[PDB]
Scaffold this active site. Structure first.
Site, PDB file in Angstrom:
ATOM      1  N   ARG A  55       0.795  -1.211   0.000  1.00 53.72           N
ATOM      2  CA  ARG A  55       0.000   0.000   0.000  1.00 53.72           C
ATOM      3  C   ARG A  55       0.826   1.258   0.000  1.00 53.72           C
ATOM      4  NH1 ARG A  55      -2.753   2.757   5.117  1.00 53.72           N
ATOM      5  NH2 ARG A  55      -4.540   3.784   4.096  1.00 53.72           N
ATOM      6  N   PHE A  60       1.929  10.759   0.606  1.00 54.83           N
ATOM      7  CA  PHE A  60       1.617  10.394   1.972  1.00 54.83           C
ATOM      8  C   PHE A  60       2.600   9.407   2.581  1.00 54.83           C
ATOM      9  CE2 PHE A  60      -1.562   7.997   4.764  1.00 54.83           C
ATOM     10  CZ  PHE A  60      -1.387   8.863   5.844  1.00 54.83           C
ATOM     11  N   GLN A  63       3.625   1.746   2.702  1.00 50.15           N
ATOM     12  CA  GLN A  63       3.409   0.811   3.806  1.00 50.15           C
ATOM     13  C   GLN A  63       3.696  -0.636   3.403  1.00 50.15           C
ATOM     14  OE1 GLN A  63      -0.570   1.102   5.472  1.00 50.15           O
ATOM     15  NE2 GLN A  63      -0.533  -0.902   6.403  1.00 50.15           N
ATOM     16  N   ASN A 102      -1.094   0.405  12.338  1.00 55.86           N
ATOM     17  CA  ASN A 102      -1.836  -0.274  13.343  1.00 55.86           C
ATOM     18  C   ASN A 102      -3.303  -0.318  12.975  1.00 55.86           C
ATOM     19  OD1 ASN A 102      -3.179   2.021  14.487  1.00 55.86           O
ATOM     20  ND2 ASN A 102      -1.131   2.525  15.330  1.00 55.86           N
ATOM     21  N   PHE A 113       5.140   2.005   8.097  1.00 49.57           N
ATOM     22  CA  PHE A 113       5.104   2.861   6.956  1.00 49.57           C
ATOM     23  C   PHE A 113       6.269   3.848   6.952  1.00 49.57           C
ATOM     24  CE2 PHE A 113       3.225   6.691   8.899  1.00 49.57           C
ATOM     25  CZ  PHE A 113       2.636   6.152  10.007  1.00 49.57           C
ATOM     26  N   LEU A 122      -0.675  12.379  12.366  1.00 47.43           N
ATOM     27  CA  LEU A 122      -0.484  11.029  12.896  1.00 47.43           C
ATOM     28  C   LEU A 122       0.155  10.972  14.285  1.00 47.43           C
ATOM     29  CD1 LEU A 122       0.592   9.315   9.509  1.00 47.43           C
ATOM     30  CD2 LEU A 122      -1.725   9.587  10.566  1.00 47.43           C
ATOM     31  N   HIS A 126       0.392   6.841  15.836  1.00 51.89           N
ATOM     32  CA  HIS A 126       1.348   5.855  15.289  1.00 51.89           C
ATOM     33  C   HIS A 126       2.674   6.068  15.958  1.00 51.89           C
ATOM     34  CE1 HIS A 126      -1.546   4.497  12.402  1.00 51.89           C
ATOM     35  NE2 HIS A 126      -1.913   5.775  12.312  1.00 51.89           N
TER      36      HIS A 126
END
Lengths: 165, 135
Positions: A55, A60, A63, A102, A113, A122, A126
């Site tokens: 992903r 951004f 991951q 997560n 990521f 975030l 995270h």
């Protein structure tokens, strides 16, 4: 040194792209650092070698780390259970931050990521545990295989990985 | 969006006070709740004074349905992509852990996740439980 360094050699549909290395902040998040370091060397008899970045969202993050199901629904830590958010001391300050993916609070497994932008929102959700040392250009290249929903256009794999020093 | 009106509410209040928990409450609830957000559904329910036992029976059904919903909808891995809205949990659908614009987004996303229709179905199953006990 106290903070270990890990490398990933990335391949795209089998073809070598390049190497990315990370500093792992064992001095701030030793439990989270040690998980990713051990998964990177394969020493527990399972880990990241051969797994894929499933992903990738341009502008951004990238991951990966689901080496059990390869699609986001798996992953496993070295602790025999998902593990707590260790702390949220370190912030998501721009490209190259390494942080845990997560499924909510205190659900860390093996997914992570790599930020390709500042993602300050975030912070507190995270656990940041490392940063890209060398190879940010390789991360930037990997971003070109993503899409707005994260589906990749080619198989972006960790062809090899381990510890440096 | 306009939060439900005192006018619609007065009606649901008059319905529950007269018909107690006869079968007729259900079709009435469905009519008065057309297009409601979860917040609006809870405002209708909160307007009921008394009938504490029956209100607790409804809550138990709502809690059971919400947990079923979570069971059948595993959370996606975070972090959420920019622009995208997280998937609703049971408690989000029931209005305890979500905001009003979230409810609106889900209801108006592409396609919709119609969190008001979902919550309304749970409420209805709870009203059926109450009607079968009392009537």
């Amino acid at each position: 040194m106290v903070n270990p360094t890990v490398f990933f050699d990335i391949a795209v549909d089998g073809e070598p792209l390049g190497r990315v290395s990370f500093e792992l902040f064992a001095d701030k998040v030793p439990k989270t650092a040690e998980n990713f370091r051990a998964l990177s060397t394969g020493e527990k008899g399972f880990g990241y070698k051969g797994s894929c970045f499933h992903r990738i969202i341009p502008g951004f993050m990238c991951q990966g780390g689901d080496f059990t199901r390869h699609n986001g629904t798996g992953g496993k830590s070295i602790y025999g259970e998902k593990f707590e958010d260790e702390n949220f001391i370190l912030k998501h300050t721009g490209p190259g931050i390494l942080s845990m993916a997560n499924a909510g609070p205190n659900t860390n497994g093996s997914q992570f990521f790599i930020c390709t932008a500042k993602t300050e929102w975030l912070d507190g959700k995270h656990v940041v545990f490392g940063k890209v040392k060398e190879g940010m250009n390789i991360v930037e290249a990997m971003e070109r295989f993503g899409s707005r929903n994260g589906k990749t256009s080619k198989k972006i794999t960790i062809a090899d990985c381990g510890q440096l020093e | 969006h306009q939060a439900i009106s005192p006018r619609t509410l007065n009606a649901w209040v008059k319905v529950v006070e007269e018909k107690a928990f006869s079968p007729e409450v259900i079709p009435m609830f469905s009519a008065l709740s057309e297009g409601a957000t979860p917040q609006d559904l809870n405002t209708m329910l909160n307007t009921v004074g008394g009938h504490q036992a029956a209100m607790q029976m409804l809550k138990e059904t709502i809690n059971e349905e919400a947990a079923e919903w979570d069971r059948l909808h595993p959370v996606a891995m975070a972090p959420i992509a920019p622009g995208q809205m997280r998937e609703p949990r049971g408690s989000d659908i029931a209005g305890t852990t979500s905001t009003l614009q979230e409810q609106i987004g889900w209801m108006t996303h592409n396609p919709p996740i119609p969190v008001g229709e979902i919550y309304k179905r749970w409420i209805i199953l709870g009203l059926n439980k109450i009607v079968r006990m009392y009537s």
